Amino acid sequence: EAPHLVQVDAARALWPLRRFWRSTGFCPPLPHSYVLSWDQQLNLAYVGAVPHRGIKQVRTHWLLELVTTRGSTGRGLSYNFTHLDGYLDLLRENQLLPGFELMGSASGHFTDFEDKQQVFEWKDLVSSLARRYIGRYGLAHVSKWNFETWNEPDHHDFDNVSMTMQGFLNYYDACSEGLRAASPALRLGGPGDSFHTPPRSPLSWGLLRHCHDGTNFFTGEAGVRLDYISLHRKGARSSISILEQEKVVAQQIRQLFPKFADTPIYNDEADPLVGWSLPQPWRADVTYAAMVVKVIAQHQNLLLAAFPYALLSNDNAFLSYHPHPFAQRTLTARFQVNNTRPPHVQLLRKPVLTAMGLLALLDEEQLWAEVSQAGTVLDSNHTVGVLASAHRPQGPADAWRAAVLIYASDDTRAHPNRSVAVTLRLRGVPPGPGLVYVTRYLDNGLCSPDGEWRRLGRPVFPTAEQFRRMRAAEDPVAAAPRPLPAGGRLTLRPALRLPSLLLVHVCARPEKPPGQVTRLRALPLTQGQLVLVWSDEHVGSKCLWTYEIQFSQAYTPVSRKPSTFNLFVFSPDTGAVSGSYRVRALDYWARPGPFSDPVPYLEVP
Ligand SMILES: *[C@@H]1O[C@H](CO)[C@@H](O[C@@H]2O[C@H](CO)[C@@H](O[C@@H]3O[C@H](CO[C@H]4O[C@H](CO)[C@@H](O)[C@H](O)[C@@H]4O)[C@@H](O)[C@H](O[C@H]4O[C@H](CO)[C@@H](O)[C@H](O)[C@@H]4O)[C@@H]3O)[C@H](O)[C@H]2NC(C)=O)[C@H](O)[C@H]1NC(C)=O
Ligand SMILES: *[C@@H]1O[C@H](CO)[C@@H](O[C@@H]2O[C@H](CO)[C@@H](O)[C@H](O)[C@H]2NC(C)=O)[C@H](O)[C@H]1NC(C)=O
Ligand SMILES: *[C@@H]1O[C@H](CO)[C@@H](O)[C@H](O)[C@H]1NC(C)=O
Ligand SMILES: CN1[C@@H]2[C@@H](C(=O)O)[C@@H](O)[C@H](O)[C@@H](O)[C@@H]21
Ligand SMILES: [Cl-]
Numbered sequence: 385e386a387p388h389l390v391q392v393d394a395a396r397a398l399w400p401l402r403r404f405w406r407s408t409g410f411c412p413p414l415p416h417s418y419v420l421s422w423d424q425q426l427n428l429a430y431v432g433a434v435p436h437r438g439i440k441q442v443r444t445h446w447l448l449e450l451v452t453t454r455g456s457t458g459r460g461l462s463y464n465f466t467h468l469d470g471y472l473d474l475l476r477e478n479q480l481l482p483g484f485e486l487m488g489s490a491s492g493h494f495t496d497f498e499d500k501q502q503v504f505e506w507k508d509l510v511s512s513l514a515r516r517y518i519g520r521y522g523l524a525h526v527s528k529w530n531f532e533t534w535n536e537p538d539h540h541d542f543d544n545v546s547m548t549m550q551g552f553l554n555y556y557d558a559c560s561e562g563l564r565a566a567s568p569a570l571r572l573g574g575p576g577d578s579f580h581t582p583p584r585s586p587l588s589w590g591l592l593r594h595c596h597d598g599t600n601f602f603t604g605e606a607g608v609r610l611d612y613i614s615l616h617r618k619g620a621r622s623s624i625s626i627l628e629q630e631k632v633v634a635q636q637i638r639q640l641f642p643k644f645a646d647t648p649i650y651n652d653e654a655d656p657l658v659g660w661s662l663p664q665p666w667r668a669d670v671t672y673a674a675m676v677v678k679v680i681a682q683h684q685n686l687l688l689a690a691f692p693y694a695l696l697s698n699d700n701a702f703l704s705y706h707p708h709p710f711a712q713r714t715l716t717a718r719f720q721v722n723n724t725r726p727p728h729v730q731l732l733r734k735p736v737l738t739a740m741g742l743l744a745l746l747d748e749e750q751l752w753a754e755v756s757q758a759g760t761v762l763d764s765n766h767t768v769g770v771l772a773s774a775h776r777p778q779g780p781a782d783a784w785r786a787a788v789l790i791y792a793s794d795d796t797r798a799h800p801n802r803s804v805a806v807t808l809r810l811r812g813v814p815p816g817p818g819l820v821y822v823t824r825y826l827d828n829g830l831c832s833p834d835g836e837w838r839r840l841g842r843p844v845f846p847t848a849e850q851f852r853r854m855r856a857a858e859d860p861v862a863a864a865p866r867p868l869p870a871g872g873r874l875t876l877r878p879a880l881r882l883p884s885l886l887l888v889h890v891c892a893r894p895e896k897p898p899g900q901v902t903r904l905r906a907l908p909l910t911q912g913q914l915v916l917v918w919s920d921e922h923v924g925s926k927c928l929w930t931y932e933i934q935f936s937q938a939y940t941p942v943s944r945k946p947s948t949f950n951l952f953v954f955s956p957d958t959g960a961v962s963g964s965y966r967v968r969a970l971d972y973w974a975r976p977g978p979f980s981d982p983v984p985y986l987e988v989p
Contacts, residue, residue: 386758387805387877392772394786394872394890395812396752399689401773403746405680407652407697408715409443409483411535416449416543417491419471423703423718423729429907429917430716430731431701432478433951436926438744441483442475442701443652445535448488451509456493457501463490463509465516476521479919483652483697485576486510486559487534489545497551503558503601510562514570523567530650530695531563532614533574537587552587553594557601560609573612576652579633588615596641612694613637613644616653621796623679624765626654627687634691648694654679655713656796660702663711666796668834670826672713673739674793674883680743681764681771681791689750700736706844710734710834717833721910723845728910730851732833733858733949735826741949742824742860742887745787745926747775753788767794767882768804780895781924784816788888792880798828799882806880808888813872818893820867820972821874822929824860827881833857848912848955859947860887865929865972891927891972898969898977899924901931906985912959914985917951918967927972934979937963962987 408431412418431439450467475482489495490509494502518526535541537552547555556574563570577588595610617629630651638645656675657664666672676698687693704712709719715737719730751772755762762768768791775785792804813819828835833854837843840850868874868890878886903919916933930946937960944952954961964984969977 388768390808391754392810393752393812397749401750405696407441408701409699410701411445416446428478434740436744438740443483452491453493485532496546497555503554506558507562511565514566527569531572538585571611576614612648614650618658619656650695652697653699654696660713663708668710669832670735670883671798673735677791678793685764746773749774783892783894786890790886792884802882804880808876810874816892820865821890823863824887826860827884897975900978901967901980904980904983913955
């Protein structure tokens with residue numbers, strides 16, 4: 385068993401690296417009017433706390449069931465946007481954007497998209513919505529949003545809404561014109577389905593044909609705007625299978641629809657396995673996290689480094705249910721702790737979520753890298769692979785960086801007995817002030833809250849103490865900053881588990897220390913516990929060791945594992961949580977940034 389050799393050249397910056405994977409999504413349960421519950425508020429706090437904007441978009445189904453109506457077509461029709469405002473504000477509060485599927489019936493009003501009056505009403509609803517949120521958040525903000533068709537139109541998922549082939553095209557034109565009437569800057573794509581071989585997926589292929597050659601319902605004009613094409617293709621447990629399927633569909637689009645040769649393609653349900661709620665042990669831990677990284681690596685290395693692929697979304701923002709808090713396709717593990725007064729909810733950060741924080745350390749340029757075993761060169765379509773990046777500095781709060789993310793993953797298969805010897809030879813590091821490197825490591829032995837849960841006997845309602853034990857496995861194992869050797873080379877010989885993730889971060893020292901933590905808030909969990917959450921928007925550099933939290937009832941530091949996750953659950957052994965909190969960044973050279981404004985918290989008994 386010859387070791388895997390991973391060579392990286394930090395002088396050879398090859399091309400841009402785009403962070404095309406910063407998306408998640410979910411569907412609310414039946415009936416369609418949850419998204420405003422404390423559970424969801426906590427869930428989106430965890431999603432937005434991934435550092436350095438590591439998750440940006442939350443693709444959310446049934447948004448237009450958050451709109452209700454009064455009156456009627458003949459009486460005079462009014463919309464109540466209150467609940468939609470709530471969800472969108474909640475996203476905004478967490479620095480997230482909706483993947484805005486135009487999906488729903490506005491509480492039973494819309495029934496038939498071949499009914500001429502309804503198609504007109506839809507256009508005006510879409511325009512009203514768009515103008516409303518342009519007013520609420522500014523056009524710059526709303527024009528970042530991916531507006532999209534109704535989810536999976538060929539999967540008959542319409543409630544009491546008749547959506548025939550022709551109805552879908554009318555609906556589309558109403559979406560397209562509605563948005564256009566508000567602003568030409570707004571983006572719309574679709575269909576968000578499989579694109580199986582014809583005669584399958586008629587509404588998906590039909591939409592493309594309509595937009596390429598058909599006639600606009602409202603303007604009679606040939607051709608209709610289509611700013612991106614969204615497909616769904618999942619792996620059936622194979623990672624590389626996702627890409628293979630995407631290439632077939634993308635090639636069929638290129639030849640059949642020449643006007644869409646450059647039209648960006650999204651896979652906004654790019655999951656290892658269909659069926660989020662189906663319990664799978666690999667979904668619980670680093671097996672899934674490493675596979676998600678591998679899928680992304682494959683896409684960067686075997687596709688983008690030429691079809692116009694722009695977005696990949698792991699559809700994993702669902703909330704898990706008893707009796708499978710960890711084993712569902714979710715970023716967090718939900719515990720409904722019913723036996724307190726009152727009942728409360730706790731979430732644990734699962735490794736997949738933690739991995740998104742490692743991916744987020746990748747910067748804007750891809751570096752040359754090569755993996756080989758015994759002299760044979762191995763591309764990312766193998767169990768071990770790599771993604772390496774570099775940062776070009778600008779400011780004095782900034783300096784050169786390299787991030788090298790290595791994965792060991794056999795898709796959904798874990799191999800607890802195996803050890804994979806890896807030699808990382810990093811060469812070409814430009815000279816710079818105070819060059820240091822930091823490792824962060826994840827595997828099922830060291831960083832699996834699921835594993836801790838099972839070691840504790842799978843408590844259905846964990847005690848506070850059991851929760852602390854479980855959370856102690858959330859973060860990666862980090863080695864403190866070490867100076868780089870002289871000469872600009874670094875050679876390391878880690879033993880990786882299968883699965884595992886290792887991020888090697890090499891940073892030059894910026895002239896100035898980190899910026900200020902902002903937007904600190906304290907959220908109640910239960911007597912004796914709260915969540916602290918904040919933004920790293922003005923922190924500057926990614927060369928961060930931890931966030932120092934201080935508490936005052938003189939300010940005292942709160943002792944904890946190092947973490948760059950922009951969220952912390954504070955569950956002191958004493959239950960003493962009333963007082964003031966403040967947080968600051970601590971960088972790799974032990975320099976603090978300035979404290980956040982203090983945030984007071986008074987518990988009510
Ligand atoms: C602590 O208190 C909480 C409530 O505050 C309880 O939470 C409920 O827990 C049960 C699980 O024990 C949940 O029931 C499950 O609901 C799932 C989703 O239901 C919705 O969505 C589906 C599909 O999208 C619809 O079909 C359905 O009508 C709902 O709208 C179901 O998918 C689950 O079904 C699976 O397992 C069951 C067997 O139990 C089978 O019947 C099914 O075939 C399927 O494979 C399941 O029914 C319930 O949703 C939770 N409620 C809430 C509000 O979240 C906790 O149970 C309680 N803790 C303890 C330990 O008692
Ligand atoms: C990824 O590697 C696999 C090999 O594991 C490739 O799939 C094989 O292709 C051969 C011939 O082309 C087929 O006979 C087999 O069905 C495949 N083998 C196995 C064991 O699955 C696949 O082509 C590679 N994919 C990419 C995108 O490079
Ligand atoms: C709109 O809906 C909200 C939430 O259901 C409700 O509280 C509010 O009063 C409604 N407004 C009107 C004008 O009906
Ligand atoms: C086909 N069904 C998948 C489903 C799942 O696999 O659970 C889930 O990701 C989405 O809510 C649906 O839009 C797609
Ligand atoms: Cl999956």
